[model samples]
Target: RLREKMRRRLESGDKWFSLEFFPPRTAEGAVNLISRFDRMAAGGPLYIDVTWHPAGDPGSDKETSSMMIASTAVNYCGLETILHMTCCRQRLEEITGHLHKAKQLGLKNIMALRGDPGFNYAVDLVKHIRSEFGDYFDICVAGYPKGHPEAGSFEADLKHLKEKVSAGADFIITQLFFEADTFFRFVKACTDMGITCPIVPGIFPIQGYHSLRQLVKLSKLEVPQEIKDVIEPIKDNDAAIRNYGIELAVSLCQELLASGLVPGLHFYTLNREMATTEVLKRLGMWTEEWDEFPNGRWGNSSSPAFGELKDYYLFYLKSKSPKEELLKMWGEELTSEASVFEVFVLYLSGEPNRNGHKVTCLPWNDEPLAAETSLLKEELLRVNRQGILTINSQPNINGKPSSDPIVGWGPSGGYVFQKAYLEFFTSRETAEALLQVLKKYELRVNYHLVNVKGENITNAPELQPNAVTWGIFPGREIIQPTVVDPVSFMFWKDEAFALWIEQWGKLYEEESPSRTIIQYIHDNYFLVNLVDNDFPLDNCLWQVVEDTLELLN
Candidate 1:
């Protein structure tokens, strides 16, 4: 029977329709309420909605009156109904129970409201409903496009709406406002707050002069001065007032549609269709072209199709190859001459290391060394491709080991001996040759472990036991060994070999060739060291280094 009624409305060419009901005050009123519901259902709606009233000395139980009738109607007729749950004159538990009863009766949609505080009840009721039924129901909360009268500021009201949305409100049904700009601004504010939900603009038809004031009072929305001025001239003329209101609503709806603010229009109807029908006709949106009157008219895109295929294609084409097109579109040329590093540094202040240390400090006049260090670090980080190298060393051979050695030397001395001996025992040629091999394959030096025999002996003097007797080498400064050995034989044998292996590991991890490390060592170390210093050494090391460098280059 409900379906037949809806079918007739569709046949009559009305696209969208909704039904409204009020709360009954007494038991006899409740019985008559069922008859009223049956009569309304006979003229089917897309969805039926029941009103909630605040509890007061006026004697009706606000909690039981509307919710009970709606729940009963829904169970009996199996019609889709939305229970109006207001935050006025009701505690959290009372609202929750009402909503639970609605759910029990299979009602899914709930219109949550901060209804007018006639007798000191609105704010708390709204807050309680927001806290409890915010997420569970397909909830719709109130919004004021033109801003709330009670709100101290327009921005504050927008913020309040955002808070409601953030609290898990499904969608928003805005308070009826006359101006299109107000709705646009409200929508923009919502977008800025990242509230991406359907905000259906509530549109009520101005059927008569007195009706507008009544509706405004019922909704607690302020009538704008511009709208009031337009109506004042025709206050006594009902037909002219009706036409003017319809025209205003049509213009507002058109602007809203063009601005892409509204997903769909919801007509309040107020149980009359004259103003609504006229506005739709003016917009050329009222047509039998749609299959279903209200719900199916959504697919109808007759007038200035929003997001049309042509527009979408143009947007798509404009966005294709955006980086290149953006430059071209803005009449700018690609700048290949300017260094990308300079641009990046200008924008990002250069890269940072693991410890939040900047790779390069902005160069200053006095701190040339700091500037150089920064440049070197930047170059190293950039050139390495893998990451910046971290050279870690064992304690200066002076620090004590964990335990004592069974031999003459202490545990520290023994530990130093083991490390230094490992370096000293390995041949310089073998170490250099290993580096040469790594150069034949690219590698990056990330971590280098140094084992210096002379330093170890100097740090733990007892390790040498008899330095003069054993022909032990004395400790020397960092660069002295390079000159003493000429080809940096001591360093190549110890630190260099370690550096090569460290670099090789990094290269392996990066999937780069170890030859890179080998080549860098060959050019920077082997070749430079061999040329810079005069030394009589094995021909094999020189031959290997030279051969590896030549092969790589």
Candidate 2:
């Protein structure tokens, strides 16, 4: 249904076709112009247009009158006519009267213009017509493709054009332009500004170099540099110059069609059929059958000529393919990790060997171990974890006193206790005795042996204000003794922690210990080491862990 309506309009033979005529000065001149209209009428144009002429000095003897001659010609032809009205010279009441007369004469279309000011008139007459007529008549307005000469800027002219469209001008016919890009940009700018009326591109097929130059200067249109250069070489050769003009016009039309920038083309015949016919043929728009008919065979087989030209133009103008360009822009690669400990260890030991006899070296010396042990015990009991020993300290702590006096145990086995007192000969026996005790009992151990120097910790900057206060487990001890520490804490927030706890819990399922450690605080520090061991090793691990958990989620 939609296609049929469009086809009726586009393919309809009796489409809105009209020609403009200037008024003649004398009665005999008026008759001669009327005969010209009569001859054009046989071609079956939808309507004949009459131009309005402004009144001049009385001494000059009115050469021709626009509105009067137009009215008379419509009456004589017995055909529909459209009167051209301009805001240039006429008053509001005067223009309204002309429209009223045309409406009375059954003239349905009005070609509105802001005529040349040199002819003596106000600008923006289209605005006045719109204010008076509103929607009582169909209105057509003019547009310039290259910027208007007086306006001097394309953007400025565009703003004025939008105002006219907003005032309800029904359609626009653009001034002839050689380059398709200029017309395309002009139309795009209008559309961007929300002007949605049909834009008919007026095309002038250049027939001669002299006439073309005159038209360009008179109309103030920009001729393409390429076209000017081409015409220059053949300017003196008439035949060569004519062919060059036709070729240039055909190229422009072809581009407009391919880009779908043109809705339709209007040819300014300039009263010569030869050049126009040659251009249509070059553009594949000419047809032998269509030429024979005086009315151009409306809705007949001849319409295919225009349709075929349009199709070829569109095909050549389509955008280039983008697949290769898109592919060229794509990218991908592998990322490197900070540590290789997991993979290196996997290669070294084949797999985890829990049952093997290999011993892990203790990481401490005597004096530091003694001090660490004292602090651990004091902080552990101070927090009421006597049965629940929470080991919260910097690296290197001594062994716990064994109930069996012959054997003693430490966080990292006997090696840790021996190493702590190795410098003191007097304490060597006591440390050696403690190592034997630890090995004898095979006591379970847990240790945090950080690899940062003491000097680094002492020289570190003071903690940020409010930093410790924002931890999730503020004031809770980070490490605990095996007897008191819940299995859950060992692997907290980790798959290994969860798996180990779950596996160990299954072994003691009947006893069903409350494995969850719910304590908020044990002493003054957080309950977990927050610092990532990979960097900034001097940081307090517990404080780092607490801050990370508090902020991340």
Per-prediction TM-score to the true structure, in the order listed:
0.40, 0.42
- The deviation in Å at residue 21 for candidate 1 is 5.7
Per-residue alpha-carbon lDDT of candidate 2 for residues 1-553, written as tens digits (9 for 90 to 100) = 2123323655553233334454543344455556655655654444455645343211122334555555666676765555666665556666666677666755566777665432232235555555666666667677877766678588888887777766666667787777788788888888888787767677777655544444444435656577678776555333466677778778877887777546556665433345655665676644332221111111112111111111111121122224332112110110111011222222222343233322121111101123334432433232222121122233222333322122232111112121111010101222233233333222222111111111111111232110110111123322111111122222121322232233222222243222221111111112222112222232232332233233332
- Model 1 residue 231 lDDT? 73
What's the lDDT for residue 465 in model 2?
12
Tens digits of lDDT, candidate 1, 1-553: 3334434644565444454544433344355555555544544445666655453121133433666666767877655666766554545465667666666666666776666533133334445555665544556567777777568888877777777766555667776677777788888888888887667676766755545544444334556667678776555444567788888888888887776546556665432345666776676665521111111111121111111121111111221223333222212321221222332232123444323434332111111222213323433333223111212111112222313221112112222111111111212343344355544323221111123332211112221211100112225211111111211222233433443434222333243333443334323332111111111222122333345344444
lDDT of model 1 at position 375 = 21
- The per-candidate count of clashes, in order, stands at 21, 26
